[PDB]
Structures are given as C-alpha cells and as structure tokens.
Amino acid sequence: EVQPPLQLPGLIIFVHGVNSEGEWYDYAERSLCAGLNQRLGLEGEHGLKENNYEGGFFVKKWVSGPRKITKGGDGRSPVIRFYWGYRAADNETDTYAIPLKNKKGDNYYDLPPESRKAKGPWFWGGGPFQNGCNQLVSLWSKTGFNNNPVPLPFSTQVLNRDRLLSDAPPRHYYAHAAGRLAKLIKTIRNQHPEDTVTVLSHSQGTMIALAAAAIEAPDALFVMNSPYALENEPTTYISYPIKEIISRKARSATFADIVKKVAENKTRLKWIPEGKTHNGLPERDNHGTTWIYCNPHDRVMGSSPLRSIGWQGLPDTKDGTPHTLFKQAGDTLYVRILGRNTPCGGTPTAQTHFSNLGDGKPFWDSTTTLLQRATWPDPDSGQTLTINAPQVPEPLTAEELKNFDQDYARDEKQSGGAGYAYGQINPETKKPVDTDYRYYISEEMLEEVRTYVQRPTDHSTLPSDERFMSRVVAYDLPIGYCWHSWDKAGLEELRRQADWLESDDYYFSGKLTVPPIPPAIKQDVAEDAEQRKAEEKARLR
Amino acid sequence: LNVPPPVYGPPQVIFRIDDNRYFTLENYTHCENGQTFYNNKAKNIHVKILDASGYLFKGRLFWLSTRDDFLAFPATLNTRHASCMGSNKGCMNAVIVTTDGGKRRSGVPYGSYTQNPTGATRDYDMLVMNDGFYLLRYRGGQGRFSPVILRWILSTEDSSGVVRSEDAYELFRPGEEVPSTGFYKIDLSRFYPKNNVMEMQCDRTLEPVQPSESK
Ligand SMILES: [Ca+2]
C-alpha cells in the first residue's frame, strides 16, 4: 500500500436543479477531476480522482441508490455534492398532487393511507418542477405555482386539461435551501480560511446558488442553464404576483451586485499564475469570477415563457455593442456558449452567432408546427453573443459539436410494452426508458397515451458533457495559491452537511429556516399592474 | 408508410470466447445495430442476448465462465441513436443476465447516468466467472488505474438471478485489507485469454449498402 496526502486545490459545491437528484454529478465530477489532473500536472497516485457512490437497484421498480460511498470508492475529489428538495409537513402530505418519495425510494401513491407517513418522511429530491422562477425574490414567495387559467413547462410531460400541473406548494423551500448553502460556504470559511470555494449550479439551482452569493458569496460562481431573465416576459406578467414582477433595472442590478460580491474575494495572500501551459497559454488565477454557461438548444430555457440567460446568455444590442450588464458587473463576469456548429473555449469573439447557427438547419431541433413554434419561437433576427471568456489549450471545434443538438431518435408509434417511450422498457438494456415514470403516473386512453416519446430537451447536455468539463471548465476553475493537506473526517462532515437527507431538520421534522432577503436582491416592481391585464385579456380570446 | 424492405448483413463473430463458444452479431444494417446471439456449436445453442449491437461496448471482456446456462453480456446504448439522449437524467448502460440458458432475460443496470453510453464503456473491464461477473470502472485521467470493483453472484431470491456481493476485491490477495482509495492498481494478466481477444471487433466491409428511393 502507498498512502499519499490529499492537498486539494479549493472545494467545489455541485448544486443540482428541479426534480433532480444530481444525475450529472458523477460524470461531471469524473471529467472535471481528469481536467484538473492534466491542467495542474498531477500524475501517478498523486492525481485527483472521483468518488464512486452506490448505484440504484430494484425491489420490480426502480429505486434511487443510497447516497453512500461504495466499498473502496473514496477518492481524492474536491467535490462537495450539495443536495436540496421539498418535504411535506407532518399532516399535509397529499394536499399537493406532486410526486413524493421517502428516503428508501417508495412512491407515496403506492402505499395504503394508514401506512403512509407512519415512517419515511415524504419528500421529493430537488423540489416539485412546475415551480421554477426567473428571479430571486420569488424564492421567498409565500405562494406556490397556480395552474388556473404555455406557462411553466419542464419537459417530462406531454405537450399539445392540465394533467400533472397540480397547484404547487409555497416556494420557501427554495430560499431555505439557499440559506443552507450560504451556511455551508460560511461554515467552510470558518473551518478553512486560505482555501477556495467554488459553487457550480444548474437549472433552478442557480437561483439557490445565487441567493447564497448575496448572503455569503464564494470565491467563484458558475451558473449553467440559468432561468434568470432580465426582462419580464408576458408569461411572467400573467403568472407571478404583483410583488414578484421585478423591473429590468432591478434584475440587472441584482445580478451585478451578486457578481461584485463574489468578485470581492479576488485578493488573497499569495497553482502558480507564473505558469504557461503546453499550448503557449498562460495559466490564470480565476478568483472572484462569475461564469454563465448557455445552451442554445435548451427546450426549457429557450421556451417563450423563459428565454433566459441560460439559453441566450447576455445578447448584444441592436447595433452590436456588448450587453449592458458587462459594464455593470465589471471585468469578472464571463460568458460561454455550448451549441452545435459552434466552438467552445476558443479565442474570444465579439458577435458570436446565435440566431443563425451556420449549417442550414433551423434553430430548433424538429420544431415545425404552429404550436411548437409558439412554445419555442426562433430567436430575434440576427441576435449575437459576446464570448469574453478566455481560451483553453484544447478547445472544442465546431466540427466536434456538429452533432450535439439531439432530436427524436424514432418518433413512430409504439407497441405498448416493448418500445422506446416514457413508461416502457428499453428493449436493449431491459431497463425502463425513464425511471421517474412510476413516481408520476399517479378509458385507459390517457394512461394509454403514457407512451408519448418525450422530445429530448438539451438541458442536461451541457453539465454532463465530458469534453466541456475536462477541456474548458477545468481551466475555468480558480485555484488557491497555497494548497492544504486536507482533513480525514472534516471533509466527510462537509458532505454530510451538504446532503439535506443527513443534516436538514427540514427533512427530519419540517422546520423551515428561511433567511432574510439580502440587500443585493432588489424588489423594485415595474409598473405592471395595468400590463398584467393586457396579457390577461388575451387569454380570454 | 410504403416502407422499403431492409437488407441485413451476414452473421459475423464480434467476440470469440473460444473455438466452440462465440458471440455473433446478425440481422443488422451496420455494426452499431442488429442483435447479438450466443453460439455453442457443441450444444447446438443459438439464442438471442442483445436487441442491439454488441460492438457499442468498447471496453474489455474476459470470459472465464465454463457454464452455458449462466450468461452475462454488456447492454450498451448508442450515443448517436438512443431515446434517452437529451433526457434530463441521461442514459444508463446495463448488463443482460440470464440464468436459464437464454430463454428468460433480465437487465441489471450499472454505471452512472450519462450523455455518452458508448463513451463510458471505454473505461470498463468486465469478467464473466462461473460464479457471476465483476465490473471494474477506472477512475482518474489517463491509464486504466484506480478501479472500483462491483461484483454480482448467483441467487435464487431475485428475479434477475444475481445480487451484488459486498465481498468483492478478491482479485488481489483476498486478505489485503482494501483501503478507502482502492488498490492502485490491479493486475488482470492472470485472466488474459489464450487467443488474446479483449475488445469487441466488427468488420464494416460486410455492412450492406443499398441505393434505393431516388426520389
Ligand atoms: Ca436536442
């Protein structure tokens, strides 16, 4: 045996999204560790390696594996796998027709009512789904999603009255989860002062991460496929309450002040930025940076209700001048794009193509009908992006990404039991197509249409991409100047505090601890009371 | 609609266990589709194993099982064509396990959720022993170093026929006190086959082209 030291270069916190249990966690971790190992010259037993966790199993019916390290699976990894979700109260479980599962992985709607809630606190990992939002103030909302007369779509649900769109519970579980994250960061800084804290968020989790930045900003923030929108779309007008319809200047100021709060931590006692890589590029100290990763095929973030920065990034003005937010947040705000026929990690460009992707194909993968184009409208004519992010030693050629925007593998009719559709069994792996099915299905017509070939939505493509993390994001991470031989069980305590199934009293009892709204989060409502009626009248038709 | 009938290529071996036992891919348009059958000329066996091409598995496979009634074969999805691509969770490869000779088939999922089912196989080793099968997933960057070992063994209490044995890591001195990181690294030359075949191979020359539908 040969027992080497840890010496990690800054901790990383993975923040998942909605109805997600960190699917992209494992193999963003693997790729990012390999990228760091090449970037910093680590080799042999000294190199970093990913953790390995226990997989799922049958009891049959799928069960999410226990969040425990597998035998001999503890590796040299700086990843803190954060987790969050929503738990039902001790007496108010089935008021919200939303998916619910216990820790052991049992469907609430599959057990007798008298047995239900005897034990196994009911919850859903990552929070409902129909409850996202495009601003930070809505995380403190006393009111959940209301379905009463496209609004809040999130794939995993048929398109073209209101099946699964039951009225969602209040959104405190967002802000509360953000407070937990803002705890862990500050908790890390208490235990460890000269190390680096990186937050790596996805989907709705970005808001949670962003809210923790306004409380305790980390040394680096990464937002992948964020629902943050600097303008209130008509759907935002008709859905959100008057209190949570935030003005354009206020949303931009909120983001800018969060980037400044994160950029505050760019001065520490002095990797060595006196290093030039094998490709002639200078290694960069990425302290206090905030990175926006966008996917131009995101069927969730490109949909007309959102059209957020996780899809279009920070687009350019009508005359080519870069986005106004760049000057607001300063020189520590960066943007990267990951789409088909588009280089990622190359030389920075001023007007990077967005609406004309450059291969003749339409902007939207197989979007032809009037309703489909109404749900996913093409971006404005000639929209452009600034990619001010640095270059990487091995960037992604547009030819490598010519196949990156997925589509219907086969949209023919399905047999009923042996096919490739939601509630079926992949005839190759003998495994269900989509597992969540069971925790969702709760004459046969409707249940007989539970074979809708769900359209691939390029939402998890960006975080799961091995090439993007290993060759771009790895170099985009900051590294503290003085590494620290890490602690035996201290780091495991951090992971325990991250997993809310192991430390959140909200999961054990239900005691929400909602933090107050930080000063960086503005609540300046736009004069929209009349404008809400304008969009409301159109729905009457 | 008025579909034209497809032409399939001739059966070709993609993993040769030995002289008598071999895996044949047949009823296919190219090396990334079709079905894979298990063949034993002595017992005159010809049963289906995968409804997909076994060439997608780019890892290594070491067949030490002498039993024609227990079969385990890696079910790997195609990155370019699969219904789980783009899905918010991704894809998950698995192994097809039969304990009745091939009539009843079951699927044991392994690995992590990914957007590259074939790309994950390039990091895997799989041993098929008489008593079950072992999967080694290599961690780190370059090289096949620092593996995590997952072991499955026969049981009659489960529908699959196999269940995970926690007592794995018997590949390297079964009393060596496995640590938290886990044996950097492990030698499999004791399992290296006599014919020196480890990866799945396919001959694209037998892929049948067809110039149909000029308009
Ligand atoms: Ca797609």
Residue numbers in the entry:
A (entry chain A): 38 to 96, 116 to 205, 210 to 220, 223 to 332, 350 to 521, 558 to 656
B (entry chain B): 58 to 272
What did the study's authors say about this model?
Enzymatic assays demonstrate that purified Tle3AIEC has a phospholipase A1, and not A2, activity and that its toxicity is neutralized by the cognate immunity protein Tli3AIEC. Tli3AIEC binds Tle3 in a 1:1 stoichiometric ratio.
The Tle3AIEC-Tli3AIEC complex structure could not be solved by SeMet phasing, but only by molecular replacement when using an AlphaFold2 prediction model. Tle3AIEC shares the classical core of an α/β-hydrolase fold, with a β-sheet of six parallel β-strands in the order β2β1β3β4β5β6. A cation, probably Ca2+, is observed at bonding distance from three acidic side chains from Asp444, Asp484 and Asp573 and the C=O group of Asp377. Notably, Asp377 C=O group participates in the binding of the Ca2+ cation, whose function might be to stabilize the catalytic triad geometry. The catalytic triad is located at the bottom of a crevice ~30-Å deep and ~20 × 15 Å.
